[PDB]
Amino acid sequence: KVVSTDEYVTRTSIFYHAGSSRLLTVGHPYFKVPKGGNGRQDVPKVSAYQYRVFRVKLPDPNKFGLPDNTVYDPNSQRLVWACVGVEIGRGQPLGVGLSGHPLYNKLDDTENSHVASAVDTKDTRDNVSVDYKQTQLCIIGCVPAIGEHWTKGTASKPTTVVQGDCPPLELINTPIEDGDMVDTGYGAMDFKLLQDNKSEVPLDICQSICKYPDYLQMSADAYGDSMFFCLRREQVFARHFWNRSGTMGDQLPESLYIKGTDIRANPGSYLYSPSPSGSVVTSDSQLFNKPYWLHKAQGLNNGICWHNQLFLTVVDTTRSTNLSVCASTTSSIPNVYTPTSFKEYARHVEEFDLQFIFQLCKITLTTEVMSYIHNMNTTILEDWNQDPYDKLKFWPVDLKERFSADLDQFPLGRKFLLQL
Amino acid sequence: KVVSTDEYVTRTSIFYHAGSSRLLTVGHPYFKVPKGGNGRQDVPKVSAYQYRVFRVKLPDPNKFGLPDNTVYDPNSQRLVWACVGVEIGRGQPLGVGLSGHPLYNKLDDTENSHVASAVDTKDTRDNVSVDYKQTQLCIIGCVPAIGEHWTKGTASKPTTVVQGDCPPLELINTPIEDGDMVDTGYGAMDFKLLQDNKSEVPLDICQSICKYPDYLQMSADAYGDSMFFCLRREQVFARHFWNRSGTMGDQLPESLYIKGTDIRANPGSYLYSPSPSGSVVTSDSQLFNKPYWLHKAQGLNNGICWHNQLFLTVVDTTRSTNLSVCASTTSSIPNVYTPTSFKEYARHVEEFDLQFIFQLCKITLTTEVMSYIHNMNTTILEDWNQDPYDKLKFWPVDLKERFSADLDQFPLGRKFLLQL
Amino acid sequence: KVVSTDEYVTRTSIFYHAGSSRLLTVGHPYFKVPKGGNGRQDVPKVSAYQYRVFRVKLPDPNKFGLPDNTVYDPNSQRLVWACVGVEIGRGQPLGVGLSGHPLYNKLDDTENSHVASAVDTKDTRDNVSVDYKQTQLCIIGCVPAIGEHWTKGTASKPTTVVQGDCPPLELINTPIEDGDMVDTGYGAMDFKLLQDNKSEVPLDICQSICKYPDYLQMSADAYGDSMFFCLRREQVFARHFWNRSGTMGDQLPESLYIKGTDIRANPGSYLYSPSPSGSVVTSDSQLFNKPYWLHKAQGLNNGICWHNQLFLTVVDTTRSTNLSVCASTTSSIPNVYTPTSFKEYARHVEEFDLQFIFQLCKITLTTEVMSYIHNMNTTILEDWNFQDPYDKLKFWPVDLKERFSADLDQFPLGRKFLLQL
Amino acid sequence: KVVSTDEYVTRTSIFYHAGSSRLLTVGHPYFKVPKGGNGRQDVPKVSAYQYRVFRVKLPDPNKFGLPDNTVYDPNSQRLVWACVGVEIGRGQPLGVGLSGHPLYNKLDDTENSHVASAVDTKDTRDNVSVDYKQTQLCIIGCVPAIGEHWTKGTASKPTTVVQGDCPPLELINTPIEDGDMVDTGYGAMDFKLLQDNKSEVPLDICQSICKYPDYLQMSADAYGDSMFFCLRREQVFARHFWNRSGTMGDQLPESLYIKGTDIRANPGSYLYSPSPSGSVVTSDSQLFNKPYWLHKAQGLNNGICWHNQLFLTVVDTTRSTNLSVCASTTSSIPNVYTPTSFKEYARHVEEFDLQFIFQLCKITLTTEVMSYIHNMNTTILEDWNFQDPYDKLKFWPVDLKERFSADLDQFPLGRKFLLQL
């Protein structure tokens, strides 16, 4: 039976402020662009619809040599940091940005099109852009957050299935790493494995995986390490209605329509996919640049940062504007414009400023306790008196050299001083 | 260690009202229009998407001969003004105004266009206008506000890079001057330096710099002089989706699409830029014509106007309507309309009414103190017992002759009297 | 130094209800239509985008013969009415109405138009209608409200300026009269003087003046008589983006663009004017048909109706629907439709019901006082006992001298006012 | 002088629940469709934009023999029902429905049309549909509610006026009957009398009268019998801007435009009428299926149901969806579709469930009283023992004489009312 951490982890009045400086990353919004070097001066994939997963490394409170031996005795008690306050800073202005595909699979406008109807024979793929679904999310833990997505499931039985048949769909949970793609309005699935077309979704995701946080699984967690603070806020609507070209794998049952006089009529495409849209982005609906104080966690782990680390997953699509930089191909432009004399580049920018208020805590290593900690994580006692998470990609944030007890010297520290 | 001003600046019950008369400026909304004089009767660039930065000069409270020697002694105490109340008046009615470009780089409509498809060869630049993103912001300090913007960064290494390559992007902080351009929905960057096209954004900004206030930097300030009062409220959405003509500098990775039967086909333009829009302007979301009382500042400087000055940065795009004035070319119009017999002019108007409630304060010039003031700003003691801000352009507001102790004689003064 | 009226005007518990009957006016929404009579059966200009400025005349409380000599003595005291409650009744249903122009100056669609491009030579003026910006405002005073608008300013210097140049713009404050045009989304200016085109804005305003209330000036007023109660609520957005035909008076600086291959290229029209729109009209955002109680005013005059009069400025564009009445040209209709056999008329309707709760007040005619009143308005004491400047302006007269009643429970606003405990 | 009913009507703790079962009506949404019978198996006009006015008949509390004679004595006291709680049940799901006209008078699109321009010569009438303005309203009284509308006023003078002139517009108050048409966004007027075209508004209203509740008149009522409970919530916006064909009855003043080179030019149609729209229908803005408790009424009559009746006017346009039922013309379907082999019918449905909580009250028939009641309504005493003007009007009869019950906990509204102790 798992026990709340408020019963065997006593808290103190020792508070510290920790904060990284300004973090920023620029790159291409759609894909990694390799440039032959001198490997490498390439630009990375920096999309506003990417998960930002910061691995915040904290100083060992037992190795911490600033507090005096009056706060605790290293004979039967050990220290561990507990997170109390969090402020996620976002820098760039609010904006909406587009993601598209030159060969998007758009057959016919199925909404109220009186223009014409397209012939299926040739390559009926139009150059289509779209503004994705708007998503703001924030998850704080000591273990990377768990996300779900749909993948091409393994064959049901030892059964040979025909090529071109619909594969089985399997839901899969995976740890959310920095750089993963968020749900953008086309669903949370493996577009690389389930769409051989390479033309159903924009370039942002057409060869990537869209993951959605498994709030149901992380909230049903026994210990609650995956998520003890969660803020979600998403919105989307259907902007345009479209048709998908390609032979229909599912036969339209003849019970549902009447063919008309031409009893040879091929039924039109009946696979409809809408263009998502995130509507208006307003600072009234903003979810960051605000202090959030964790008192009671959702799980039994009440904001205790085991192994002196803290995982912060964050998605913010309210600053998706894209910089368009263009450079002339002639050394100096002749005062005449021709499209061949300008190179066009699209760059995207992300800016963060993480701030935290941590609280020092004691753990009296009794029996019953410690054995409970052993059944929880043997490596907790082992690290007291290798790493499985380096196989995943995170944004490292080292705060061992940034802890400070002078809370009034920092904005989040002052806002926390309005809590006595 | 920096110390809060509430520990070494004692406050008094002496309150004064200060206020400018109506301030207004008219001009051209897009660019400075030179007219050969009699130099010069030109109209200036007066756009609703410009930063308005007022440099409010206050009378020296030590040289002020209105208070009696009972409030302080000029032996160990000196006076300084502290800002308590602010009301920013806006005059013109609410309206939405357009900003455009006759040669805007619009290739193809990617938002479900079934009209046609444009050929890239010829000059495919359309006459495009747009209503910018809606922005209301207000920052009060004693130091000019700090803004961020992206510029053509210096060469990465002592490396010869080919002409037409994408230049490095560098984020830069600069003091926000009166007349600077705000973020309009295309990002905060140097459009003059990063777009040799002179055709990616409307005439408002195609040769200017869009700055966004660096709230992250100003809030993390040690002393907090840059910003001790901040109100932001911005909104924007993507109205129309467009394509940019010009050769793509970044090669579209062939892993992300399938070329179709014409295996030697150039992929269409995949640089998508939306037209921003500020949606509805309503007086419910209005942010000015309201009294704001500063009690606790965000930083350690709690509204203390060092050097008897106060910097007010304000952006209000909710009054962006543009007057269209036209005059007949004939002395008296013949009652027949032809476009050649009428000259069309576009003029824009800005109207303000600044109001303030200041509080007189004492500073006991002890040791420990005063040396702290010396480490803060030697020129503070120097002015008690040149200018670094004259390099920047501000809107001068002289209030040395505008202070009044009869608070009940003024609107902001009465609203402040409802605070006892 | 001006002094608050709460320091020299003591209030009493005597309260009266005053109210006009139903007021209504019909007419044409765009322009006055003269009809030769039998002068005259003409229809006036009755637009939902017109200022409604009522001059409410109140009975003289000193001349009032209802109170007994116990409430005051006419030796050292004088009476004056003080406004306490107001309810503005609006009658017609909520609706949106259009205002347009057959020859609107619309050159090209600049809002993502792939349709075509218009030739500038010929008359490239389209028949364009638009729903104006939505505006609700209400201002109560004893002096007509002050509005601002831009006009063709006086000549800058003793300077000969070329014909066709842009005239100087001058901001002007003027009293807002009944029938004046409100800001409709094109700005507050004199379209008749600053637009010789007669084609930049719809017929509603193309030869009129759009005024916006100068809240900044009226709030900075010394006495605060112009406005001691103000409720504003406006909304608008840009619906369509357009181009203006006509030669550009300001040369586009060549630093801002690249001309292209045809080095001869005339820059397209770069004077952009959007079509305003007031979005949805809903009764949730409604601002009238509600009681409003004046306790503390914004200015020093705390709702005191000097000279026993009260000016009520109101704008309500949430009932801008236009009735279309059509009559057959034949005496009895032949059961066949032809556009020539039906005459079409557009009529607009406004319905109000003004309601007020006034409070009787005393003014002890001391020294210091009375001299203060004399420096304020000599005509206040002169009109007491120890011509009119406003008859030059057009108002909607509301005579309530015969409409005062002390039986508050007999009226809705009176009952709602009795709920104050 | 009228007196509040709380001064001569003492209340008791006796409470009853009264409620009709589910009421529903189906029919055609646009017009009465006659079918030759066996007269008649016709379908009636059942539109979501119709006033639903229920005439609720209550049992005579003096004739009621369930309470014992300890509560009152029929010697100097008489009984009267007073309404305390009301819940109006709506059944069908929320939906939006269209109303249109095959021969709608739509000339040109004035909302930024660069497609083409229509010639006025031929029959320029398009098939146009529209979703009306959204309106939810509820008025409870003991006298039928009063509505207003504009009608063809009587001739201005005994004057011979030319045929084709605009008739005078007269505002008229009428009792709101069940089946009357509501304001739909084209105004509250008599479309049959002021539009000989029969083509300016959709078929729903082109030959009907749209009435709007005269809140100004009913609230200024002396006794307050017309309306002692009122909930309104309406919204509308302009979706499309159009032009009206037909010769312009009002001459466009030449001061407002410049004709251009072709000084031979009839100004294009300058009568602009927008298509209304009720925007989104959401249950957040829903106004029914909720209990409403009447404590203080707006008028002096505090929810007292004189003559043991209660009038409920209600409009709900948030369920305006229309069922489309079609039946094949062949006895059994050939598996081939042709438009001639299917008959198409449009049917609309309304579902209600009225619920009430009434309170028994006593009236001691003193002098001063009773004489006041006599001056109020002689028929109140006459109907006691100390013809009908409303059957000339059309109402929805709801007989609740056999539906009163004192076991409040047996009904939902009764339980919610028991949550008030």
Side-chain angles (χ1 to χ4, degrees), chain C residues 284-337:
Chain C
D284 296 335
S285 299
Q286 201 63 212
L287 196 127
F288 303 114
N289 285 1
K290 304 171 52 186
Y292 295 101
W293 314 113
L294 183 143
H295 292 101
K296 323 176 192 69
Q298 68 85 21
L300 265 59
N301 191 329
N302 194 52
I304 294 186
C305 309
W306 299 113
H307 290 102
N308 315 136
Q309 66 180 0
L310 177 143
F311 280 123
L312 202 180
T313 302
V314 47
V315 172
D316 181 17
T317 73
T318 61
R319 291 163 171 84
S320 59
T321 172
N322 285 317
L323 306 181
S324 57
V325 173
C326 84
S328 57
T329 62
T330 316
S331 184
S332 188
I333 87 173
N335 288 262
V336 282
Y337 170 79

Side-chain angles (χ1 to χ4, degrees), chain A residues 184-420:
Chain A
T184 58
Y186 291 100
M189 43 162 292
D190 192 338
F191 293 95
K192 184 179 183 179
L193 267 53
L194 291 178
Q195 294 177 352
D196 311 342
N197 201 352
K198 296 189 177 179
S199 298
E200 308 281 321
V201 285
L203 300 163
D204 268 349
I205 58 185
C206 78
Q207 290 284 105
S208 294
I209 295 187
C210 289
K211 298 186 184 183
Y212 188 67
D214 201 348
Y215 309 113
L216 269 46
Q217 188 263 13
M218 291 185 302
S219 91
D221 196 333
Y223 294 88
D225 297 335
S226 301
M227 165 198 66
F228 47 65
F229 189 81
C230 170
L231 302 173
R232 74 176 183 94
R233 202 273 170 184
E234 38 189 313
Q235 76 175 19
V236 63
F237 75 97
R239 198 163 176 161
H240 293 282
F241 308 164
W242 287 328
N243 234 3
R244 303 281 207 190
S245 62
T247 57
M248 306 278 88
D250 299 324
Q251 186 187 96
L252 178 59
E254 316 190 328
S255 320
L256 306 183
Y257 67 131
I258 304 178
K259 248 183 186 185
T261 98
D262 199 356
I263 325 179
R264 293 115 72 68
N266 189 357
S269 181
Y270 46 79
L271 201 152
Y272 313 96
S273 168
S275 63
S277 180
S279 179
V280 184
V281 167
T282 173
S283 48
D284 296 335
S285 299
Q286 201 62 211
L287 196 128
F288 303 114
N289 285 2
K290 304 170 52 186
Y292 293 102
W293 314 114
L294 183 142
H295 292 102
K296 324 177 193 70
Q298 69 85 21
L300 265 59
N301 191 329
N302 194 52
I304 293 186
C305 309
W306 298 113
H307 291 102
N308 315 321
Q309 66 181 359
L310 177 143
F311 282 93
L312 202 180
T313 302
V314 47
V315 172
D316 181 17
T317 73
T318 60
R319 291 163 170 85
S320 59
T321 171
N322 284 317
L323 306 180
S324 57
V325 173
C326 84
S328 57
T329 62
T330 316
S331 183
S332 188
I333 20 63
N335 287 262
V336 282
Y337 171 79
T338 55
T340 70
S341 45
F342 286 103
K343 289 251 211 172
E344 302 281 340
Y345 304 81
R347 293 301 134 94
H348 186 66
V349 161
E350 292 290 305
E351 171 180 344
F352 294 75
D353 181 16
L354 307 180
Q355 301 167 53
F356 301 95
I357 294 296
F358 293 106
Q359 175 177 32
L360 188 55
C361 300
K362 313 178 197 179
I363 297 180
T364 301
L365 293 179
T366 326
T367 58
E368 302 281 77
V369 196
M370 151 178 288
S371 77
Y372 167 83
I373 296 183
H374 180 272
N375 194 91
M376 180 175 180
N377 254 117
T378 44
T379 172
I380 291 180
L381 294 175
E382 181 72 291
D383 286 8
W384 285 340
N385 287 311
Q386 61 187 3
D387 168 53
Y389 295 150
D390 200 28
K391 198 166 52 186
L392 310 163
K393 189 57 206 163
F394 303 105
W395 189 329
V397 172
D398 185 324
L399 295 192
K400 301 180 300 181
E401 59 185 345
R402 306 208 163 205
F403 268 53
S404 175
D406 306 314
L407 301 191
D408 61 331
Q409 304 283 290
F410 309 102
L412 186 66
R414 298 185 284 275
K415 302 189 194 113
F416 176 70
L417 289 189
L418 263 70
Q419 297 288 278
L420 178 66

Side-chain angles (χ1 to χ4, degrees), chain C residues 22 24 26 28 30-33 35 38 41 89-103 106-107 109 111 115-118 123 125-131 196-199 203 206-207 239-240 242 279-284 286 288-289 319 321-331 333 337 339-340 342-347 349 351-353 355 407 409-410 412 415 419, chain D residues 1-3 105 109-115 120-125 133 148 150 157 159 163-167 169 171 173 183 185-189 194-198 200 212-217 219-221 232-260 267-274 279 285 296 298-300:
Chain C
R22 174 158 47 189
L24 49 81
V26 316
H28 196 273
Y30 303 153
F31 46 77
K32 178 198 297 182
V33 187
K35 316 297 243 296
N38 198 8
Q41 327 103 321
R90 293 295 272 111
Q92 299 299 272
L94 300 185
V96 189
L98 302 182
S99 310
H101 201 302
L103 308 181
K106 169 187 150 196
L107 179 59
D109 186 311
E111 189 202 8
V115 187
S117 177
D123 180 26
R125 285 188 301 186
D126 308 13
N127 192 334
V128 160
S129 72
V130 71
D131 68 314
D196 311 342
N197 202 352
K198 295 189 177 179
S199 298
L203 301 163
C206 79
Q207 291 285 290
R239 197 164 175 161
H240 293 282
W242 287 327
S279 179
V280 184
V281 167
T282 173
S283 48
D284 296 335
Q286 201 63 212
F288 303 114
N289 285 1
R319 291 163 171 84
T321 172
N322 285 317
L323 306 181
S324 57
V325 173
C326 84
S328 57
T329 62
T330 316
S331 184
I333 87 173
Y337 170 79
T340 70
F342 287 103
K343 287 234 210 170
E344 302 280 340
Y345 304 81
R347 293 301 134 95
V349 161
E351 171 179 343
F352 295 76
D353 180 16
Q355 302 167 53
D407 307 314
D409 62 331
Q410 302 282 290
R415 298 187 284 276
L419 262 70
Chain D
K1 179 173 179 180
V2 58
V3 183
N105 183 19
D109 184 55
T110 58
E111 188 203 8
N112 181 43
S113 184
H114 197 268
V115 187
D120 183 80
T121 299
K122 311 301 294 183
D123 180 25
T124 165
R125 285 188 301 187
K133 153 183 174 183
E148 65 186 329
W150 286 97
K157 334 174 195 301
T159 289
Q163 179 62 44
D165 294 13
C166 185
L169 304 185
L171 190 63
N173 288 129
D183 164 53
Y186 291 101
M189 43 163 293
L194 291 178
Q195 295 177 353
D196 311 342
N197 202 352
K198 296 189 177 179
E200 308 279 321
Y212 190 67
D214 202 349
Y215 309 114
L216 269 47
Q217 188 263 13
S219 91
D221 196 333
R232 75 175 184 93
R233 201 273 170 184
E234 38 190 314
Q235 75 176 19
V236 64
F237 77 99
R239 197 164 176 161
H240 293 283
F241 307 163
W242 286 327
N243 235 3
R244 303 281 207 190
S245 62
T247 57
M248 307 278 88
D250 298 323
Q251 186 187 179
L252 177 58
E254 316 188 328
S255 321
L256 306 183
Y257 66 128
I258 304 178
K259 247 183 186 185
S269 182
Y270 45 90
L271 201 152
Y272 314 96
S273 169
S279 179
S285 299
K296 324 177 193 70
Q298 69 85 21
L300 265 59

Side-chain angles (χ1 to χ4, degrees), chain A residues 80-257:
Chain A
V80 62
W81 289 114
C83 182
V84 164
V86 172
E87 186 178 333
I88 300 175
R90 293 295 272 112
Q92 298 299 272
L94 299 185
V96 189
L98 303 183
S99 310
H101 201 302
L103 308 181
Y104 189 86
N105 184 20
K106 169 187 150 196
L107 179 58
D108 287 336
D109 185 311
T110 58
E111 186 199 8
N112 183 42
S113 186
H114 193 31
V115 187
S117 177
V119 180
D120 182 80
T121 299
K122 312 300 294 183
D123 179 25
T124 165
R125 285 189 301 186
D126 308 13
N127 191 334
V128 160
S129 72
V130 72
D131 67 314
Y132 283 148
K133 151 185 172 183
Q134 181 189 326
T135 308
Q136 304 179 77
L137 77 93
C138 167
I139 296 181
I140 314 175
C142 55
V143 165
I146 278 75
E148 64 185 329
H149 78 274
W150 288 96
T151 200
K152 179 185 281 182
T154 53
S156 183
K157 334 174 195 300
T159 289
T160 59
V161 67
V162 194
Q163 180 62 44
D165 294 13
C166 185
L169 303 185
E170 178 179 352
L171 190 62
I172 280 195
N173 287 129
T174 41
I176 301 183
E177 320 176 37
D178 176 79
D180 295 14
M181 299 303 297
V182 207
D183 166 53
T184 58
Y186 291 100
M189 43 162 292
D190 192 338
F191 293 95
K192 184 179 183 179
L193 267 53
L194 291 178
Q195 294 177 352
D196 311 342
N197 201 352
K198 296 189 177 179
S199 298
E200 308 281 321
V201 285
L203 300 163
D204 268 349
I205 58 185
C206 78
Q207 290 284 105
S208 294
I209 295 187
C210 289
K211 298 186 184 183
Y212 188 67
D214 201 348
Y215 309 113
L216 269 46
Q217 188 263 13
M218 291 185 302
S219 91
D221 196 333
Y223 294 88
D225 297 335
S226 301
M227 165 198 66
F228 47 65
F229 189 81
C230 170
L231 302 173
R232 74 176 183 94
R233 202 273 170 184
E234 38 189 313
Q235 76 175 19
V236 63
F237 75 97
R239 198 163 176 161
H240 293 282
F241 308 164
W242 287 328
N243 234 3
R244 303 281 207 190
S245 62
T247 57
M248 306 278 88
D250 299 324
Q251 186 187 96
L252 178 59
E254 316 190 328
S255 320
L256 306 183
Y257 67 131

